[PDB]
Amino acid sequence: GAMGSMERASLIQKAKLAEQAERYEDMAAFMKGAVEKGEELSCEERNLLSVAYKNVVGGQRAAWRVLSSIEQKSNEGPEVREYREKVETELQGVCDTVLGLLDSHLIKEAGDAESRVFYLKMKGDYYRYLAEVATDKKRIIDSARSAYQEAMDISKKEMPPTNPIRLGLALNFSVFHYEIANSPEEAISLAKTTFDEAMADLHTLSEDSYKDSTLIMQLLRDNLTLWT
């Protein structure tokens, strides 16, 4: 790996610099290098990994949607299809890279609920991103569902209802149901029960944790407004 010669601590430091500079491709490459040092990641480092790749794939998803819309309108030369395929293939490459890091060997070494749920959620997320462009589609959807479901089972057993990782997992699984799996009723049910159960646990939290939890609860609410 091109980052194999750099110290782990230097890679983490440079990932934080890249974030400040909004250089998310660099940030992802630094965090990939840190993962490949073989040590488990701290909570802070897991978040840096997620921030980096979510911004990279986020730009690719936005571009893919633009090009796909143009392509569908053109079907109401090969260039539009070719360029959409180019972006699609790069997007799939990033998703495969993240999934590879999770499988080699972040998930298998993650024993604590906070890390294991975080990584399984990520696995569901990047299979969901693959599903968005798939037309293998059924198997990709099943892989996302399976990862989300294992994460959900652990989170309900091991985390309080207001835990931001648990909340963000439930949010994304509900989006999976609504956008990917053609299950809007499952999506609404999951979002509502998650919101209500979190509401009832807010009283246990400090001011800072309260802010973290309610931020994600507002996203659940906004989706329920959009879906109903």
Binding site: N47, S50, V51, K54, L169, V175, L219, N223, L226
Partner: peptide, 8 residues
């Protein structure tokens, strides 16, 4: 639909 922020 809104999905989760990356940092949690």
């Amino acid at each position: 639909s809104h999905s989760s922020p990356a940092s949690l």
